[PDB]
Design a protein around this ligand. Structure first.
Ligand SMILES: C[C@]1(c2cc(NC(=O)c3ccc(C#N)cn3)ccc2F)N=C(N)OC[C@H]1F
Ligand code: NA
Ligand code: NA
Length: 379
């Protein structure tokens, strides 16, 4: 408990392409880099020589592969993959010293799913069976892991942003990865890691919306999404308030919609003109909340691959949503995030690695008194 030195720094990534962990599948073990995704629940790996993949799962080389004789077709808003289901032995080399028999979707056809130039070749969905494809009888990886071994039912993520890196602690918490205290918010329902936001402030100024609008139709903690997505109505209010706060410079309208970048001369980004963003989350106790606060360092994302420009360019990474709030890497890179499945709660603490400056830091503060927090959930 509290110290897992072998798992620290077991994540890597490149800006814009997400965080992955090394895993091995099959016997003899095949090593693959696997995107860590708390917003889905299938373990699905490339299994055919797609041109974007550095490597892929070759089932014929595995003596322990067992075919389930069942296909799965999985469309997303943008991507799709289709694959064949089976089980095989899986380990995490920088992980607990255990091997489990897990479900694996061997992806045989995909579109807009893999990223050209990325170093991962499959996804590890860490959310619950309720959103597994094709249905909830396909047991997710973490469920199998906890069933089959003595690993405690919790994991924790420290995503360190910009090469990016971080730690996924499987079965526990490493107190070196955060400062101050953890504050916990309840998992409202076990499908996505669904939470309830009860108040939103921009530079300490409350948006004063009906708090149900913050969770319309849900709010989730999602390591497989870059941005902070906000329900459209809330996005509209948030942007207006952020524009107002930063209005000491004028940026094209398109910037705020993520339709264009903004660039400054190297090392001169005016961080100070941009506001902090605070989300108050439902706490553990009736009428009690806490707040997490992020900086423009989290929500202005560096864009490196800009052959059009000499300068430091940034994308605004808060965006409007039709799927509810998504606390993606923009929120997670500020904090150490504990997915305490055993107690159905998510903890937040200020991350020891988050990017900040000499004036401001990400913050997790409590308690606050917030009434009618149960009304904030959308049904
Ligand atoms: C299954 C799915 C998914 C995520 C990513 N993720 C990424 O490619 C990515 C890219 C950058 C970051 C960051 N930071 C995180 N993830 C790539 C393919 C995917 F199919 N998972 C989530 N959560 O929602 C979208 C959904 F499509
Ligand atoms: Na167990
Ligand atoms: Na600590």
């Amino acid at each position: 408990r509290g110290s897992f030195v072998e798992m620290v720094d077991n994540l890597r990534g490149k800006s814009g392409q997400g965080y992955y962990v090394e895993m091995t599948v099959g016997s003899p073990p095949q090593t693959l880099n696997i995107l860590v995704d708390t917003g889905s629940s299938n373990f699905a790996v490339g299994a055919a020589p797609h041109p974007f993949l550095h490597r892929y799962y070759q089932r014929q080389l595995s003596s322990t592969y067992r075919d389930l004789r069942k296909g799965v077709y999985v469309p997303y808003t943008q991507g799709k993959w289709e694959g064949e289901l089976g089980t095989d032995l899986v380990s995490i080399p920088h992980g607990p010293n255990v091997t489990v028999r897990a479900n694996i979707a061997a992806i045989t056809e995909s579109d807009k799913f893999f990223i050209n130039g990325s170093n991962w070749e499959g996804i590890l969905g860490l959310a619950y069976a309720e959103i597994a494809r094709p249905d909830d009888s396909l047991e997710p990886f973490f469920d199998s892991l906890v069933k089959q071994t003595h690993v405690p039912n919790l994991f924790s993520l420290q995503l360190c942003g910009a090469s990016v890196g971080g730690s996924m602690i499987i079965g526990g918490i490493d107190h070196s990865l955060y400062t101050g205290s953890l504050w916990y918010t309840p998992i409202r329902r076990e499908w996505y890691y669904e939470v309830i936001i009860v108040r939103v402030e921009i530079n300490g100024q409350d948006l004063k919306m009906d708090c149900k609008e913050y969770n319309y139709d849900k709010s989730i903690v999602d390591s497989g999404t870059t941005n902070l997505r906000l329900p459209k109505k809330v996005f509209e209010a948030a942007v207006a308030s952020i524009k107002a706060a930063s209005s000491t410079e004028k940026f094209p309208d398109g910037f705020w919609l993520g339709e264009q970048l903004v660039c400054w001369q190297a090392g001169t980004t005016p961080w100070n003109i941009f506001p902090v963003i605070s989300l108050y989350l439902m706490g553990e106790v009736t009428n009690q909340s806490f707040r997490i606060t992020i900086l423009p360092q989290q929500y202005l994302r560096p864009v490196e691959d800009v052959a059009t420009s000499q300068d430091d360019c940034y994308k605004f990474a808060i965006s409007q949503s039709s799927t509810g709030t998504v606390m993606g890497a923009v929120i997670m890179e500020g904090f150490y995030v504990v997915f305490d499945r055993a107690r159905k709660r998510i903890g937040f603490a200020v991350s020891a690695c988050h990017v900040h400056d000499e004036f401001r830091t990400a913050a997790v503060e409590g308690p606050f008194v917030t009434l009618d927090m149960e009304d904030c959930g959308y049904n």
